[PDB]
């Protein structure tokens, strides 16, 4: 049954090439560049005493949650820098953290195979472990909320799972990835999500039934970052090959590649502005860069972090961008 | 400027900051140890003697609180989560001597040691190597010579010489000899003395870190 795999892959590539009548590079040539997008560090969130690997912005564009190796989640009031909540973690090894769209729940996890959900609206005040999503056989890489009751998870098992917090058990398991899944991205409509894995491939999945809609390839190394375009018809990915690639779901292939000779290191996080014109991705060597989603030019540099920019997030309204880093500090730009 | 509730929110943030600082100060004195080895290297036995995913074992010895990370259950890609342990004071390595002729786990253990010790994240991290289950090595070697797996071995197939050669080959894999040190030891099923050796290694690592801070190392 594997003899026809190469033939089908060749047919898919031929169809993609036939439908590739033009490229975004020649289509956006006449569009004026966004210019130098200068951003200042409006806020400097301090209080973390260990390497920070994940963060998530709130739907209100004010509250954000960050995770560090100190085994605790800190809810930051970005407008005033106040720490809304401090949530000790039973496991000090946390690699991902998510903030519920309604804000009533916060989830995180990591080397522990549980994407523990924390209830911020607890009656007793102190934040408790509402549920533990056990069942994964590998380190958790990312679990993003869908609603108060549904949440997706990605881990090192090479598979993603959909969980119901009330039930506490998997309801839809996503399989097909050969490499470890490192990131997740939820579409604006919440109907589809794309997960990047270490096999240099990004796959589109359906939450309702778990079927893989599409498979994306082109990266030369492991994929560590993924984020949807605001319209939901495209998404960008960041891999260890130091080049960010933009994929359109309908086109089912790469559209633009963002890379520079100066950058010779992998990508850690990727995000899009509200309009999606500006592509912001975290990079090694302790600085971040902004790429024009259309012109692919380096719009600007978000420098100031003393360590790797592990995570990057943009407010739903696009008012500000908060970048986490291993120096235990989050800076809002 | 700030209202009554805003002042209360700032006070709550200050209390959270104080709690965070206290927790960080407590954790700074805590000793972080990483446990690695083959599937049957005996790391589980070691942690049991001292005391699905990562397992944290906490124990205390001579005023030092030690927390060990058993990452043997992590079957995922190593480089995607090994970097999290960059801050570990020392890395404990478990190797089963008896598995020299058991099918070639010694080869896998040596590859693991080469990958971990030479990793960019552990350039300055010392490795506390442990040779587990020599009570089986001393007997099996009598019947099965060590030359079966490694023709390069020379001399009589005695437990002492074989152990010395295996140790020397282990520290031969170290490409950062001038930057890190390997503290090899044999478990011998001696809980008290094994924990004493671990404590001595931790103390030596802390002393070298202090000397580095002083510029002497």
């Amino acid at each position, epitope marked *: 049954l594997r003899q026809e795999a190469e033939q089908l892959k060749n047919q898919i590539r031929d169809a993609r090439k036939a439908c590739a009548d033009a490229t975004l590079s020649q289509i956006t040539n006449n569009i004026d560049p966004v210019g130098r997008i200068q951003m200042r560090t409006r806020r400097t969130l301090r209080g973390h005493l260990a390497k920070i690997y994940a963060m998530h912005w709130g739907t209100d564009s*004010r*509250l954000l949650v960050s995770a560090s190796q100190d085994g605790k989640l800190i809810i930051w*009031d970005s*407008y*005033t820098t*106040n720490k*809304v*909540h401090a949530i000790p973690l039973r496991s000090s090894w946390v690699m991902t953290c998510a903030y519920a769209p309604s*804000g009533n729940y916060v989830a995180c996890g990591g080397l522990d195979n549980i994407c523990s959900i924390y209830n911020l*609206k607890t*009656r*007793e*005040g*102190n934040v408790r472990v509402s549920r533990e999503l056990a069942g994964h056989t590998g380190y958790l890489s990312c679990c993003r909320f869908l609603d108060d009751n549904q949440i997706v998870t990605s881990s090192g098992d090479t598979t993603c799972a959909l969980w119901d917090i009330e039930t506490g058990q998997q309801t839809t398991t996503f399989t097909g990835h050969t490499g470890d899944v490192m990131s997740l991205s939820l579409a604006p409509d919440t109907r589809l999500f794309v997960s990047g894995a270490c096999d240099a491939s990004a796959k589109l999945w359906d939450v309702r039934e778990g079927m893989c809609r599409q498979t994306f390839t082109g990266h030369e190394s492991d994929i560590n970052a993924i984020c949807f375009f605001p319209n939901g018809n495209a998404f960008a990915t960041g891999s260890d090959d130091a080049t960010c690639r933009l994929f359109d779901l309908r086109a089912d292939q790469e559209l633009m590649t963002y890379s520079h000779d100066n950058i010779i290191c992998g990508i850690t996080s990727v995000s899009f502005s509200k309009s999606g014109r500006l592509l912001l991705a975290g990079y090694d060597d302790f600085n971040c860069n902004v790429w024009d989603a259309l012109k692919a030019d380096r719009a600007g540099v978000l420098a100031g972090h003393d360590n790797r920019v592990s995570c990057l997030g943009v407010t739903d309204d696009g008012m500000a961008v908060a970048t986490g880093s291993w120096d235990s500090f989050l800076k809002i730009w | *400027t700030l*209202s*009554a*509730e*805003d*002042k*209360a*929110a700032v*006070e*709550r943030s*200050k*209390m959270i900051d104080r709690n965070l600082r206290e927790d960080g100060e407590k954790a700074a004195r805590e000793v972080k140890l990483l446990l690695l080895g083959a599937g049957e290297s005996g790391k589980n036995t070691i942690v049991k003697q001292m005391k699905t995913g990562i397992v944290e074992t906490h124990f205390t010895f001579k005023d030092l609180h030690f927390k060990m990370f058993d990452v043997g259950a992590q079957r995922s890609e190593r480089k995607k989560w090994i970097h999290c342990f960059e801050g570990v004071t020392a890395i404990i390595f478990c190797v089963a001597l008896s598995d020299y002729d058991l099918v070639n786990r010694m080869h896998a253990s040596m590859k693991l040691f080469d990958s971990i010790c030479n990793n960019k994240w552990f350039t300055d991290t010392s490795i506390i190597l442990f040779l587990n289950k020599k009570d089986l090595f001393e007997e099996k070697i009598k019947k099965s010579p060590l030359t079966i797996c490694y023709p390069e071995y020379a001399g009589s197939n005695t437990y002492e010489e074989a152990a010395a050669y295996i140790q020397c080959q282990f520290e031969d894999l170290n490409k950062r000899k001038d930057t890190k040190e390997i503290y090899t030891h044999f478990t011998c099923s001696t809980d008290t003395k094994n924990v004493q050796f671990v404590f001595d290694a931790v103390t030596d690592v802390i002393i070298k870190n202090n000397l580095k801070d002083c510029g002497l190392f």
Partner: single-chain antibody
Amino acid sequence: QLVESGGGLVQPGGSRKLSCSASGFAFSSFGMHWVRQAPEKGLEWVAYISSGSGTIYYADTVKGRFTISRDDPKNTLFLQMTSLRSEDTAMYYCVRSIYYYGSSPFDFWGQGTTLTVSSDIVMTQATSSVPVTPGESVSISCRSSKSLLHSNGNTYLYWFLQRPGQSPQLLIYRMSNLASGVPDRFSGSGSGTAFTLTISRLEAEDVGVYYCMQHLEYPLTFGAGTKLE
């Protein structure tokens, strides 16, 4: 759950100890307020102690006369009272509050205990009485002498409903957010200085006294109280 103890008849100028045992919640992380209600008059703020006793405030009528302390290990709130005056007779309510973005201060009020002795913003509720019947819509108007719309955009106003023979319960906080467990019937809106409470499809349990409270700066003040029957 909050229970108050240390009441009873006292002579004028005497001293008594009030104990407010706290259970069912993290008393350490919750700020505590003391509110005293006379047998017929409205609520009156007494004192406030923040979490960890880092900040303590008292009303002008009791400043320098009443002291408030906390003991987290015992989960009990203490209020040492000395030089009790004749007017001090009132039912003291132990109020729970936590202050952070999106929080609901004064959400939970204790049952309270009755004690008998042998510049600030003032809320106006001239509409003392407004008869209502089930299924009818009624509006309660509250006015303040100072604009409660802070520079940050938060209008620090609170609505409390007290049923006959029951302690007050938080109804609306910040003039726009309904406290947990409050039916969606109640609504809150108003201008910088003009405030009003809207009740839709009023039903039997809505009967009670509604109090308008301001939290822009201490000391806290409560309205006269609108009685619905």
